[PDB]
From a paper:
One superfamily member, human [name] ([name]), has been implicated in several seemingly disparate diseases. [name] is a porphyrin transporter that is abundant in erythroid cells, where it is capable of accelerating porphyrin biosynthesis and protecting against porphyrin overload. [name] has been implicated in dyschromatosis universalis hereditaria, a condition characterized by hyperpigmented and hypopigmented skin macules.
Several cryo-EM structures of [name] have been reported, and here we report an additional high-resolution structure (2.93 Å) of human [name]. Notably, the resolution of our cryo-EM structure (2.93 Å) is higher than previous cryo-EM structures. In addition to the canonical TMD and NBD, [name] contains an additional N-terminal TMD termed TMD0. We prioritized the global resolution of the structure over the TMD0 so that the resulting structure would be appropriate for MD simulations.
Numbering used by the authors:
A (entry chain B), B (entry chain A): 237 to 827
Write the structure that this text describes.
């Protein structure tokens, strides 16, 4: 069960490790593994040369062979680099080469997560805040690369190093030395495991007390006026010092525990070194070992102990790493609510009709739904989606864009149901003029060019001229290519509105879901917007949604939505003659 | 100049180090210094014993003396603990004892800063946000203790260790070995210094690029609706890919530089080890040194090199530490704007009069001042401080509490000018009822007992009964001692208002600067507040400030402030007969 899941997690890590496409990175990782094996050989070979040097000195060896032996050992030591600190040539070269591989896998996972996040639905994005999602994403990617590197380069190589050391001592020394080192490692790890949990128990409550102390301090200083009112400066410093005293007590518990842990580890190392040194001294006394074996044991056992010092640090790090990785996988586990059907054919859009019929959209987490809405819009016409201020208006536009899935009913464009056609093909033929146009942190060229990435500067200039903003574009200080955005030059409502008009001009849509922004910047500017809007909406189909009544006058068909169902339909004079909510609401808003 | 300032800073650190009062901590630090000297002796004594062991093995020494020599060396090694990692008994004991000393100094500096912060003026507190001040304070305290420990225990001891090593090699070996180690340390430090600045230059721009990449990513995801509008998922992942690629390039520059730094240090160590090993091998070949000297040099030179590995880490840490300390000292450099005069005598308050006369308060960072305000309030009277909504009303109350210093004029209470009397004595006889009462995170007992810390539960209950809140206190779920605050049970406007009434009841003031909260919770509750207000204000002098006109009816003297000067003074009927702004504003607010 859980072991099978762990195996799948390991399989996924293995799949992330190997570069599938690049042929050079496969050679890089193969070279890296070779360097790892070589570094293992260096660690076991250095003490043998140190023994050889000492055995040559203890006898009267000539300077000729001694010189080459000493130089060879130092070169061998230079490659190894000793224990922790001052890493050797092989380890540094292996770390230098692994940079490209870890960058490649980090980039691949980052793009996979980002593409998936954009592939989800609108409802999920409204439900969740994006900041924590980005935090989960980056933590997951860092966790994956860090966990992969640590497991392959730090844990397994050293476990092999300890096994090799035990095998060497048991074979080429008396088997007692193999027993001594085995018992030392068993005791060393067992004691570190059983003490670290005790230490972290003390560590946990320290943070909570630290957070509690400063909260009282900042609350004392924030209400400065009341403190001065009642003369409680001495009283509040006394309370602060008492909270400090408690925090100091927790600090002492944690620090004392850490000192005990270090002393226990040092003691275990000392006892193991004592047992080996005395046994080796006895055997060399009785003409069974040589003088070089004493120093070989002394150097090698310390070489074996040094890596184990960081066992606690990775133990408390690997747990956080794994939960972050699981959190990332949980993030990728989500699926799109609104899915494309297996058919997902293109769109047979020739001229473009619109037909709603008995659309009973059950809107989640909201009290505003739509019940029995049904109307048709022929090509080259209008339909004003005016009515009381409710969520049912914009729900129609977002439901026609397939932002939200149908609940009950059918949507027909040119006689084709929109559910079977793919998402992009349907969505490409729809142009929207949002309530508040959004500009990114870039120039004017690539903000107007966002409606179609493949467009030259002449084309975007013609589009700006057609919209009617080119004069302001030229009048801008930096020229046609000024910096406009949240980090750059600010623009007015009409400026961004005509940007969106230019965007939808070069989008070349078939049906426009025009929404009135009704920002009411200037009446003359509003008329200019209307003139440009008639220019961009000429000879096409629009579903104008207006919060005012000016554009409702010219609509061929005019609809009033009674909080989910259409109540009045026809023409403005006909609806004024009907004298429902239309008549008095028009009288109120006209004066 | 700057060196003199550095010397003063060192003197201040020295003053912070030594516990002035506690007699036990002086013994603790003296023991700690002794342990430091002992640890230096251990570091120089261990290799001598290792040489002794090897020289005994190389000859046919009996097992009797060899056993004690080996055990003595291992015990000596256990005390030392070797190099970095697995610290010895002496170092752990020294760290264990230093906890109390660093806690004591950290607590003392923390309380000094907090007391100073409360000792400043209101204007400074309004000007600056408190959160960053707390951050500066805690960073300064941690910087002081961290820098003190590092300088006394890590830099100086090792500088002594290197000097001792050079002296030993020059004296008890040939002086060539002293030259070799001196050249190695000079080259090692010089190369680390000249490479670290180059490395951090590469490191600086990496952070800026990292911040720039994620900003584009999060801006892409925040505007999800527009991305889906224009079909730019592929376009945006491409932009994210390119930004990632640039960040990877900066990462590679930084990582490559670090690898070069490590390789350079390792190579310098190797060359120094090569020179010493070959020279020592030659001398032991020519019957000038013994076989134990070869291992003595090998162990000692590595013992000397190991500490220098962290030179970069403290170099990049000490700079941040010092600037944080300077920032803290800058914070403590500020002085109070409103100071007590050297006289600062008590107050001869017997019955209590109030006299303003030609007070031309020039209010900073504000357009509302007060020009020629002059009125007198006899004991047991009223004075309604009503008028148009301006900052000149509350400025009178805060100017009488001496939050702000006088600018031009005199303030007399019972014929005594308040400037000469001390701050606390004047401020103790004034009771204020603020606009919005503030409650801390504590119980009912110590919230109403905040008006006077020395009070029993019977007294606070009687005060609550007099105010009129005891019934609600009993009705609370937890009883008389419920948890009320921002983290506890919430209370209404009338609840906290009667809390403040109880506070000022047990404050026992002489003159009350009553300010009407006019929260308008309930009309009956407002009448109850008025009845309690008359109960607490009976037979004392009040300067009632009302944003409404109900309490202005009963005032003996009624004032209207014309945005800095009093325009109308007298009684409500007399002012209604004058028929200025009083008459029409009363008619407007009465209906
Ligand atoms: C250090 C020297 C003096 C002795 C050891 C020689 C070789 C063991 C090493 C040193 C540098 C290595 C090269 C450094 C960089 C690369 C680039 C590497 O390709 C990539 O990084 C491609 C990246 C991508 O496709 O995105 C392929 C291996 C290669 C040629 C390496 C092959 C193995 C080399 C020659
Ligand atoms: C898969 C990864 C973890 C790499 C593992 C490599 C080891 C299985 C091998 C590779 C080369 C071996 C070394 C090659 C040569 C020698 C010399 C050998 O010399 C002797 O004392 C025995 C020979 C003799 O009797 O003269 C001692 C073992 C040692 C260091 C070997 C130890 C085991 C090593 C490191
Ligand atoms: C890492 C880079 C900077 C290169 C470092 C150079 C060393 C590898 C060289 C420089 C001096 C050389 C040494 C100079 C002299 C000798 C004596 C030589 O003795 C002989 O057999 C020849 C002399 C004689 O006949 O007595 C043996 C090699 C050795 C130790 C040499 C070994 C190689 C050394 C250490
Ligand atoms: C995985 C790690 C912890 C290594 C553990 C492997 C053990 C099963 C080995 C290593 C040491 C071995 C022992 C080391 C040496 C000897 C001495 C040998 O007997 C003699 O040499 C007798 C000498 C005499 O009588 O003077 C009998 C096996 C024994 C106990 C060995 C039995 C098997 C042991 C315990
Ligand atoms: C001389 C050589 C053989 C080493 C002996 C050193 C001992 C003095 C140390 C080593 C391990 C220590 C123990 C390691 C862990 C614990 C558990 C600790 O309590 C818990 O962690 C219990 C928490 C729980 O699991 O509920 C109390 C101290 C104690 C017994 C320690 C007491 C002191 C011990 C025995
Ligand atoms: C010089 C070398 C040998 C280090 C010696 C240091 C000791 C004097 C310190 C290290 C850890 C300390 C202990 C750390 C924590 C505790 C638990 C503390 O009690 C609890 O917190 C109980 C918790 C529970 O009941 O679960 C009482 C003190 C004690 C035993 C401390 C006593 C003093 C100890 C043994
Ligand atoms: C907790 C860690 C540090 C392990 C501690 C284990 C030691 C206490 C044990 C392991 C092997 C033991 C040794 C194994 C074999 C011998 C040889 C034995 O004498 C012989 O067999 C002589 C052989 C001959 O003369 O040929 C005397 C005891 C002694 C030293 C033993 C004494 C106790 C030792 C060192
Ligand atoms: C770190 C803790 C676990 C203590 C480690 C203690 C060992 C290092 C001691 C205990 C047993 C000792 C051995 C016990 C017996 C002998 C046999 C003894 O030989 C004799 O002269 C008596 C026997 C005979 O007559 O042959 C020489 C010392 C020696 C090897 C001792 C060497 C040192 C040993 C291994
Ligand atoms: C059988 C069970 C109990 C697991 C045992 C696994 C250990 C053998 C592993 C886990 C953590 C490892 C250590 C984790 C971290 C380090 C530091 C690492 O080097 C660095 O990252 C240096 C960082 C620095 O210098 O600040 C080299 C491997 C090493 C010594 C590792 C050595 C092997 C250890 C002890
Ligand atoms: C570790 C042992 C087996 C050998 C070494 C003995 C002494 C060098 C050390 C060990 C513990 C030390 C004691 C540990 C704790 C204290 C408390 C200390 O007082 C305080 O911490 C007072 C704090 C305050 O007043 O706020 C005075 C020194 C003293 C007695 C120390 C004196 C020196 C002692 C006895
Ligand atoms: C103020 C702080 C930095 C402590 C500094 C202490 C050192 C000045 C002293 C204290 C004890 C000294 C040690 C005491 C005894 C010896 C034995 C001495 O033995 C010899 O080889 C010379 C004697 C002889 O000729 O037999 C070598 C120096 C050494 C380690 C001394 C080195 C210098 C030490 C560490
Ligand atoms: C850290 C705590 C857990 C205490 C550790 C105990 C050690 C300090 C003891 C246990 C065994 C002792 C050894 C046992 C036997 C001997 C042989 C002994 O030789 C003799 O002169 C007596 C035997 C004979 O007559 O042959 C010399 C001391 C020595 C190494 C002893 C030194 C002190 C040792 C290592
Ligand atoms: C602060 C650190 C870097 C130590 C620097 C101190 C130097 C001024 C000392 C240390 C080594 C000394 C040198 C080491 C040995 C000798 C050999 C000595 O002459 C001989 O022994 C001649 C032998 C022969 O002719 O065979 C003359 C002094 C000299 C050059 C010494 C001069 C003074 C030196 C450079
Ligand atoms: C064989 C032994 C003697 C060691 C020689 C190793 C060299 C290959 C290393 C050691 C120091 C290195 C240098 C250390 C620092 C710099 C400065 C660095 O550029 C800067 O930092 C300049 C910035 C500025 O100050 O404006 C360019 C590389 C360089 C010359 C390095 C080139 C490679 C060097 C010479
Ligand atoms: C295997 C051991 C010997 C390490 C060898 C690693 C080298 C291949 C790396 C380490 C640092 C790298 C250098 C780090 C930074 C730079 C600066 C870079 O140019 C700049 O950024 C210029 C900056 C300026 O003009 O100020 C060009 C590549 C270069 C020389 C790199 C070239 C490759 C180097 C020398
Ligand atoms: C960059 C760092 C690693 C320093 C490198 C310095 C070495 C290259 C120098 C320092 C001292 C020099 C040595 C100083 C003295 C001697 C002894 C000299 O011969 C004698 O004086 C013999 C004396 C006698 O026979 O009594 C031959 C050269 C040699 C080895 C010198 C060779 C070059 C050495 C090792
Ligand atoms: C790490 C870098 C700086 C290179 C380090 C090189 C040294 C370790 C070499 C270079 C000079 C060498 C010395 C040069 C001269 C001599 C004299 C030579 O004696 C002879 O037989 C020739 C002279 C005579 O006839 O007396 C023996 C080797 C020795 C000590 C050499 C020992 C090794 C030394 C110190
Ligand atoms: C003459 C000028 C160029 C200044 C030279 C000062 C150095 C000799 C100092 C500065 C930083 C020091 C190091 C900074 C940090 C450490 C780690 C410190 O131990 C720890 O804090 C361990 C932390 C861990 O294990 O994570 C012990 C001292 C040491 C080696 C210091 C040794 C002495 C150093 C190299």
């Amino acid at each position: 069960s859980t072991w099978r899941d762990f195996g799948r997690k390991l399989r996924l890590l293995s799949g992330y490790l190997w570069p599938r496409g690049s042929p050079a990175l496969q050679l890089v990782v193969l070279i890296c593994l070779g360097l790892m094996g070589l570094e293992r050989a260096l660690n076991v070979l250095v003490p043998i040369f140190y023994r050889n040097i000492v055995n040559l000195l203890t006898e009267k060896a000539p300077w000729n062979s001694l010189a080459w032996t000493v130089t060879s050992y130092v070169f061998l030591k230079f490659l190894q680099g000793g224990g922790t600190g001052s890493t050797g040539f092989v380890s540094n070269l292996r770390t230098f080469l692994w940079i490209r591989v870890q960058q490649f896998t980090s980039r691949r996972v980052e793009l996979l997560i980002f593409s998936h996040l954009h592939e989800l639905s609108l409802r999920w994005h409204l439900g969740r805040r994006t900041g924590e999602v980005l935090r989960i994403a980056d933590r997951g990617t860092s966790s994956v690369t860090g966990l992969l590197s640590y497991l392959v380069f730090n844990v397994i190589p050293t476990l092999a190093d300890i096994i090799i050391g035990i095998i060497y001592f048991s074979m080429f020394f008396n088997a007692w030395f193999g027993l001594i080192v085995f018992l030392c490692m068993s005791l060393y790890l067992t004691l570190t495991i059983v003490v670290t949990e005790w230490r972290t128990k003390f560590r946990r409550a320290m943070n909570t007390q630290e957070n509690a102390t400063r909260a009282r301090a900042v609350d004392s200083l924030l209400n400065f006026e009341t403190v001065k009112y009642y003369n409680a400066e001495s009283y509040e410093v006394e309370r602060y010092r008492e909270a400090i005293i408690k925090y100091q007590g927790l600090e002492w518990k944690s620090s004392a525990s850490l000192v005990l842990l270090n002393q226990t580890q040092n003691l275990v190392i000392g006892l193991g070194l004592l047992a080996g040194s005395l046994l080796c001294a006895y055997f060399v006394t009785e003409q069974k070992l040589q003088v070089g074996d004493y120093v070989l044991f002394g150097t090698y056992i310390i070489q074996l102990y040094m890596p184990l010092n960081w066992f606690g640090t990775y133990y408390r790090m690997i747990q956080t790493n794994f939960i972050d990785m699981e959190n990332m996988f949980d993030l990728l586990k989500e699926e799109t609510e609104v899915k494309d059907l297996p058919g997902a054919g293109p769109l047979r859009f020739q001229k473009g009709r619109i037909e709603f019929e008995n659309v009973h959209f059950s809107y989640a987490d909201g009290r505003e739904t739509l019940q029995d809405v049904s109307f048709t819009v022929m090509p080259g016409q209008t339909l004003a989606l005016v009515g009381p201020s409710g969520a049912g208006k914009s729900t129609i536009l977002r439901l026609l864009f397939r932002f939200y899935d149908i609940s009950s009913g059918c949507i027909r464009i040119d006689g084709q149901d929109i559910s079977q056609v793919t998402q992009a093909s349907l969505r490409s033929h729809i142009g929207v003029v949002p309530q508040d146009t959004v500009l990114f942190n870039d120039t004017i060229a690539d903000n107007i060019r966002y409606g179609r990435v493949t467009a030259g500067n002449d084309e975007v200039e013609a589009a700006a001229q057609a919209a009617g903003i080119h004069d302001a574009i030229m009048a801008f200080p930096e020229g046609y290519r000024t910096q406009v955005g949240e980090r750059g030059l600010k623009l007015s409502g009409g400026e961004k509105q005509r940007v969106a008009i230019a965007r939808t001009i070069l989008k070349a849509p078939g049906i426009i879901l025009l929404d009135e922004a009704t920002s009411a910047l200037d009446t003359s500017n509003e008329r200019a917007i209307q003139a440009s809007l008639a220019k961009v909406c000429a000879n096409r189909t629009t579903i104008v949604v207006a919060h005012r009544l000016s554009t409702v006058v010219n609509a061929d068909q005019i609809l009033v939505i009674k909080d989910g169902c259409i109540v009045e339909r026809g023409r403005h004079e006909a609806l004024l003659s009907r004298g429902g909510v239309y008549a008095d609401m028009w009288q109120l808003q006209q004066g």
